[PDB]
Symmetry: none
Subunit: 31 residues, 9 copies
């Protein structure tokens, strides 16, 4: 038996001038 959990979060609030911004979320699982 194998279990594999991955969780990612990006929260943002009251923001201004987020020019040329990048948010990257990247996930891989192998067997």
């Amino acid at each position: 038996q194998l279990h594999q959990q991955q969780h990612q979060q990006q929260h943002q609030q009251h923001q201004q001038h987020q020019q040329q911004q990048q948010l990257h979320q990247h996930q891989q699982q192998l067997s």
Copy 2:
């Protein structure tokens, strides 16, 4: 039996001038 948990968080608030900003979240699991 194998368990593998990964968790990532980025919180941001009251922000200004986040120009050319990068948020990277990267995850890998192998067996």
Copy 3:
């Protein structure tokens, strides 16, 4: 039996001029 927990956090508040900023979160688990 094997357990493997990884946790990462980046909190930011009342910020200004975070130009050319980088937040990197990187995780790997192997067996």
Copy 4:
């Protein structure tokens, strides 16, 4: 009485191969 002046200039001449170039002009005023 309040006065607030902002001025920005970018001049370029006899140029070649300005590939993936970025010119950013950014201005804010508050009260």
Copy 5:
């Protein structure tokens, strides 16, 4: 009475291979 002056200049001439170049001009004024 309040006065607030900001001035920025970027001049460039006879240039070649300005690849992946960045010119940033950033200004803020508060009260």
Copy 6:
């Protein structure tokens, strides 16, 4: 009475191979 002057200059000439170059001009004034 309050006066606040800020001045910035970047001059460049006869240049070659300014790859991955960055010119940053940053200004703030408060009261």
Copy 7:
């Protein structure tokens, strides 16, 4: 008599997740 040779090569194989990748090949010759 003048001879001027320029050669560039980029080979890639068995690849994954080449996100936001850049391959630049740049050539100039003058007289």
Copy 8:
């Protein structure tokens, strides 16, 4: 008589997660 040879090579194999990667090849010849 003048001869001028330039050669560049980038080989890559069995790769993963080459995110925000840059390969730059740059060549100039003058007379």
Copy 9:
């Protein structure tokens, strides 16, 4: 008589997580 040879090589294999990587190859020849 003038001869001018330039050679550059970058080989990479079995790689992972080459994030924000840069490979630069730069060549100039003058007369």
